[PDB]
Amino acid sequence: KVKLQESGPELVKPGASVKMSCKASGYTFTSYVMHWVKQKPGQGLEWIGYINPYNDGTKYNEKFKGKATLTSDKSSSTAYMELSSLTSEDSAVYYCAPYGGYWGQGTTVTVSSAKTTAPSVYPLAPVCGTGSSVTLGCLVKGYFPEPVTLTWNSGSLSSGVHTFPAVLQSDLYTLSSSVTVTSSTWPSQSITCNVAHPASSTKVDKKIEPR
Amino acid sequence: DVLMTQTPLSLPVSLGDQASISCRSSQSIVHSNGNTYLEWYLQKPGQSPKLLIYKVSNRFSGVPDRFSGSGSGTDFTLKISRVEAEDLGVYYCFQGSHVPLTFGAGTKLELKRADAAPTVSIFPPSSEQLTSGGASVVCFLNNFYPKDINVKWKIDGSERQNGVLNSWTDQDSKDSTYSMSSTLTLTKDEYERHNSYTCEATHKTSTSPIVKSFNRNE
Ligand SMILES: CCCCC[C@H]1O[C@@H](O)C[C@@H]1n1cnc(C[C@H](NC(C)=O)C(=O)O)c1
Secondary structure: OOEEEEOOOEEEOOOOOEEEEEEEEOOOHHHOOEEEEEEOOOOOEEEEEEEEOOOOEEEEOHHHEOOEEEEEEOOOOEEEEEEOOOOHHHOEEEEEEOEOOEOOOOEEEEEOOOOOEOOEEEEEOOOOOOOOEEEEEEEEEEEEOOOOEEEEHHHOOOOOEEEOOOEEOOOOEEEEEEEEEEOOOOOOOOOEEEEEEOOOOEEEEEEOOOO | OOOEEEEOOEEEEOOOOOEEEEEEEOOOOEOOOOOEOEEEEEEOOOOOOEEEEEOOOEEOOOOOOOEEEEEEOOEEEEEEOOOOHHHOEEEEEEEOOOOOOEEEOOEEEEEOOOOEOOEEEEEOOOHHHHHOOEEEEEEEEEEEEOOOEEEEEEEOOEEEOOOEEEEEOOOOOOOOOEEEEEEEEEEHHHHOOOOEEEEEEEEOOOOOOEEEEEEOOO
8 A cells, every 4th residue: 555654753943954754655656746735733734845756856835945845765765855944833744745645644843942841730729609510620831842631530520621722832831621510529529630741751630629 | 826715614514414615716727737636635633634536526545425526617616415423524625736736724514503602710820820920810611602702801991912822622522512711821910910800701692791700809
């Protein structure tokens, strides 16, 4: 079968460069050009351009001239793409594809100057005051890099939960989670937030106390 | 630059219904060689786009025949006779006839359900964060439908956007509603120069904003 192997995720510094690879197998590399597509997280798709392995001919989207450089190696059926002068704007997932039917798994590029930083975890109890349903929260701030895994009572309490996608703060991330239970259940019982940040090998547990 | 406008940008349907997506090119996409390279893609979260239709109306290997494509010259349409759950995701039309090749903005095929107002909760800064010198005010807007919504913060009556970070969840897997978290971060100093913190949510299920609020010195 046609297979397109792309290089692992890249965490690089602004201003520098990065060169990803796309190794083709399962077909004749020189029988098709190799297109590259950019996708900024949660958004659209953009055609960067292509390289014809046979004669090294290229065609670029004027928007990416100078930013991207496409090259190819016939000896190993491997195409490459080099991004120069990175900025957070270049953070995205890059794909290679010989034609519409077969795309690589993509290469994630994250352009940032941050260092691994464990998250600050704060419990979110309701304002002093009651109805029959309570909503409790947990806010994890300023961590890096992604991701973190949050659970409630270790994973037992998983209904009525909403964990929101992380978003950039400074060049640090911030995410939150809310779980709603009947007030008959809280604070009579227990409810604690479990935040694990695999990058700093930290797992914090903060339990929600009434104010 | 051939721009590809697809309509709608969001398409709610009920399992079993029909689904039609439109895509029109700002100009003819007949390639010099005589073919029309208009394609349709479906992409699921954390995955790469999968080809469904190529050359206007040709199904790619393994693609179910309830998917069909048609149109010509400048107007193209993708139709799903009866929507299944593996069909939910983002669709794209694409043209590979004129460089720069371009994609449509995408159409998210999501699930239809009954309108539901958001359950609004507001949370003052935790004692911990305040001890650390920071002050975040959180406001959750949960379990609403449809997805379009807007949150507005008011500090002592003053509208505030500087320092507000929002995040939206994908359509819930169980009840098909949407949620949102809005967080206002100030410094403790700043936080203490004020008393009333308010988050208003205007959603289509009402012309009147649902407002939650608290007075700091209470
Ligand atoms: C991300 C995958 C994009 C695939 C684009 C190709 O598939 C069809 O839409 C045709 C399109 N394509 C555009 N240019 C090419 C290669 C080019 N062929 C033609 C007919 O111009 C060449 O041989 O240099 C292929």
